[PDB]
């Protein structure tokens, strides 16, 4: 049996940087050198693991999170960033195991008006710990005044327009699980 | 060992085309990308072309476009570098590098081969 | 995108040295960054590669470090040798094109 990347990479619509879904993949063996070969990638860095011995190896779970942010965004999704994505969307341990991916977006998610249906949280009242997901809508109280005076709403949009620092950029977060439990995933052997 | 073999290099008039090449011995050539990167005299390394596995896709450097081709025979073990309407800035010893993954190193390479345009 | 190097850097016999590759206009550290010596008149030969792993029978004075903060990958040489003296190069991969730096001119003092 084979890992259905397909279904994540080639999904029609990747989830908003706060919202980011998570898939299993499990059962499968993948030709991990099907992606890093492809060109289509401006970004393919694994962190605690050269993507070489990935077809050697064998993990418990692998889990795929995909979202879509900004292209000068990206260097955040790494471990020990810093910034609104690494801190109020997306965090990565410090210690990582796994690979992030990413290519431009700019033909499918953006729009002449903008496509405002991307969105990040901007502030909270502090940073997420890793691989945690905040979808949490409620008013947020920059000023001493109770909002009940410096009251925001946290989630803000990209409104992406073909402009690339600003243009859609579709990442996916392949994270390498080992569990003292049969490995199920492996590369080809 | 392994040995990276090229031929082919002279000299070419401008507006000339040459043909260059790269045969692989002691390693399966086949399934990495496969490039060339030339570096003129007392000067520094510049990336060229390179070009797929199984030849699907192949890319070249923006001053290139439209005047080379790059090439490969997986059964000959051999990569191919056609260069049309040469210019002299053009003129570089040129090597061919075998990258062990797309974003990894170069862990072989040819001995190189000299081309040179002018009168 | 390209990658800038310092032209020339020297430090004495038993110190070390960090070359550094730091990048305009785009994110150095959103692909890997490679690390090519090349001794005069010889063919450029892999020192570090995948930022900080090191090839079998590379001398092991050779470290790597990258610095997404200062845009900067960088090559350290611990406990330099005479013999190092060479030109060094990085290289990175942008999505359609692979792009090297200018190149570092290394000299070993004294």
């Known amino acids: 049996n084979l890992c259905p990347f397909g279904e994540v990479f080639n999904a029609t619509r990747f989830a908003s940087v706060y919202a980011w879904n998570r898939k299993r993949i499990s059962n499968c063996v993948a030709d991990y050198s099907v992606l890093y070969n492809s060109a289509s990638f401006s970004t393919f860095k694994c962190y605690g693991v050269s993507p070489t011995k990935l077809n050697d190896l064998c993990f418990t779970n692998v889990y795929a999170d995909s979202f879509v942010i900004r292209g000068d965004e990206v260097r955040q999704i790494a471990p020990g960033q810093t910034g609104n994505i690494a801190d109020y969307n997306y965090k990565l341990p410090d210690d990582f195991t796994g690979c992030v991916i990413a290519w431009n977006s700019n033909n499918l998610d953006s729009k002449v008006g903008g496509n405002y249906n991307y969105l990040y949280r901007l502030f909270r009242k502090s940073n997420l710990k890793p691989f945690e997901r905040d979808i949490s809508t409620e008013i947020y109280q920059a000023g001493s005044t109770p909002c009940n005076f410096n009251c925001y709403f946290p989630l803000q949009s990209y409104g992406f327009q073909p402009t690339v620092g600003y243009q859609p950029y579709r990442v996916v977060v392949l994270s390498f699980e080992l569990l003292h439990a049969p490995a199920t995933v492996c590369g080809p052997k | 060992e392994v040995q990276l073999v090229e031929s082919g290099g002279g000299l070419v008039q401008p507006g000339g085309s040459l043909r260059i090449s790269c045969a692989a011995s002691?390693?399966?050539?086949?399934?990495?990308?496969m490039n060339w990167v030339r570096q003129a005299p007392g000067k520094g390394l510049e990336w060229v072309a390179n070009?797929?596995?199984?030849?699907?896709?192949?890319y070249y450097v923006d001053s290139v476009k439209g005047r080379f081709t790059i090439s490969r025979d997986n059964a000959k073990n051999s990569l191919y570098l056609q260069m049309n309407s040469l210019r002299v800035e053009d003129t570089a010893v040129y090597y061919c590098?075998?990258?062990?993954?797309?974003?990894?190193?170069?862990?072989?390479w040819g001995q190189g081969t000299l081309v040179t345009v002018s009168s | 995108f390209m990658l800038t190097q310092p032209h020339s850097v020297s430090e004495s016999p038993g110190k070390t040295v960090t070359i550094s590759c730091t990048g305009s206009?785009?994110?150095?550290?959103?692909?890997?960054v490679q690390w090519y010596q090349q001794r005069p008149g010889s063919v450029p030969t892999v020192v570090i590669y995948?930022?900080?792993?090191?090839p079998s029978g590379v001398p092991d004075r050779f470290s790597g470090s990258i610095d997404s903060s200062s845009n900067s990958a960088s090559l350290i040489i611990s406990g330099l040798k005479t013999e190092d003296e060479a030109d060094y190069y990085c290289?990175?991969?942008?999505?359609?094109?692979?792009?090297f730096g200018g190149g570092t001119k290394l000299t070993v003092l004294g």
């Open positions: 290289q990175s991969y942008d999505t359609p094109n692979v792009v």
């Open positions: 206009n785009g994110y150095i550290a959103n692909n890997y």
């Open positions: 070009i797929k596995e199984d030849g699907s896709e192949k």
């Open positions: 995948e930022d900080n792993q090191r």
């Open positions: 590098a075998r990258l062990r993954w797309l974003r990894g190193n170069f862990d072989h």
């Open positions: 002691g390693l399966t050539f086949t399934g990495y990308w």
